[PDB]
Amino acid sequence: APAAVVTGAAKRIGRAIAVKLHQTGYRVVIHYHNSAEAAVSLADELNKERSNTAVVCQADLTNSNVLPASCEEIINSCFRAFGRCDVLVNNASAFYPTPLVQKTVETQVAELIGTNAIAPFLLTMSFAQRQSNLSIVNLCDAMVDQPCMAFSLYNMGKHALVGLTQSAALELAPYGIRVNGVAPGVSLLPEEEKDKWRRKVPLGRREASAEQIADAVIFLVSGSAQYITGSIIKVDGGLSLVHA
Template identity: 45%
Template structure:
């Protein structure tokens, strides 16, 4: 994809708009990526698991703006553990618009796993969403992405490389694996498919009523450590994702979008 969708469409109205799938995109950062891509002329596939109501609402808004431009696919990413289920998932994705140009790995689980309390359930869940599903879904969709000379963008974390988040060992390990997937696939899939990543810092806080919520004191200490002295916005991440999609000579790169927070991190410090 060497040009912005709007540029492509303005030159030849017979060219079908490109298609983007974003996992976990019913709300928050995923929804921001969907909205930004839709504004740029993409047809979008909104994937969700438990947030079907929010996903349908988002799709309705986008389809009112441009008819037949957004669809919702509901699936537990554990489908990657089952061959037949994964085949059905891929079939649904491709049947939505007949092609796939961009795959964005956004779905993620995030919660603490302090040593002494780590169990297999935490390990399986955090590695599924943050490492295993991105790899196996990339593999399953590879023929379709290659056909379009498309690209993959992964949402990572500034804590995935040399700066672990204290008490989040399993999450840190899973995101580190995902980061290495980005770099490995960038080599293996070149020159047909570009693979890049975006590493958020504090761009959106976990919902206060979820098991991912951060204590207020921790929230304040994190914000105090950000050089730009503010929490980022989901739109900041979406902007970087769209840049990487359109940057035809960039692959294997990870962009930190963290307000400079990575400059203040050291070891177990918040």
Template identity: 40%
Template sequence: MEDWASSRVALVTGGGRRVGKAIATALHKSGYKVVIHCNSSKDAALEFANELNSQRSDTAFVVSGDLSKDVVDTCRRLVKEATEKWGRLDLLVNNASLFFLTPLDTATDQQWNQLMDTNLKAPYFLAQAASPHLRKTKGSIINMCDIIGEQASPPLTIYGISKAALIMTTKNLAIELGPEVRVNYICPGAVMWPEVEKEHHDDSFRNEWLSRTPLNAIGTGENVADAVLFLASPSSSYMTGSCIRICGGRSLRL
């Protein structure tokens, strides 16, 4: 357990499974108390929280809500529940995200709104709700972006637009919330293949993706969690508005 983390509280959205679970696990292991947000995976999140609480009593807590519906009210409620549990908040990790294909010919208004609300609007209004608490603790925000937010990759077009906008949101919030709160972002590449249309993420797609990844490997949730720990720690105390790419070099030739 790290001394710097032992009294701190983190809220991780989408923290009950996949990359979010790896992030919450790493934060908890370092000494954080973790608030695990979930939506459809509440049973898995509760089981995960029980597991963490068995390791250290009263150190994990679950909050739930659909970040694509009633976004502002949902964000305010989640932060309220998170801060009431232990009376403070030191870290917000905006990890929850929707990911699906939106070819131009078939993209819909509903798809646009779902992706923008979950991937962009929710992180912004979670930051708004959390910022008074984070200012008190001189905490930080880490936004989970994507290398597809930096370079085009259709037909993930609307997803990419949402992540590009989240990158710019991060940079603006770093200015608005400084010097008390640091705001940084992580851009993963092929980290835990997403659960998306099989005809897109088939073996040929994966082989082609890896052929242009210099490290020729798929990343793990733990790789991303290591970057989160670094950005949350005193070791990154002079970083804000900055990015860490966890992509095996894939962004060099997307």
């Protein structure tokens, strides 16, 4: 059975991705930072379905002097548990505003650029170095070119992740590793404010769900996507096409 690493897998979109990969027959590494109880509860659910098919792995993905070692350990945890690592899903992400005009700003850089871009880069390095249907899926943002007001560092990090997706697709193609993205628009919100976000969506008659994001990940890691690399699939209900 193939094996996958999902970062930020305890809750929300990462959890849905881990569940759908497991349902597809993958063994999974459930990475978490703060959500140990939720990570272990997910692993317990998946292991009840198929014994010894889910493990957890703790790591802070903030940039620091130790982040490279932390990322090498996440990949190593998959090889140790399952003897292989076929899929990496870079899902974990910090998200909060960083206004240009008025945590230290350098802590915000470490968290926003680290989680959304540098950790994906280091995980990609470790995944490739440790190596079939191998692939990486990066969780992008469908609104990357129509950014949220006062979200500069977040937007910079998601732009950097587009660059990584494309750069790594090119560089890792000779190794047979595909590198793609899934770009949610409005997916799971953290009622009046939620409804303001919902109302913009052309396909809004249909509820946005973590499972719809996971469905695009399942396609990209499947044999039905064996010629697809460097592609970012928007899963946004049309939101990115709506003008101001």
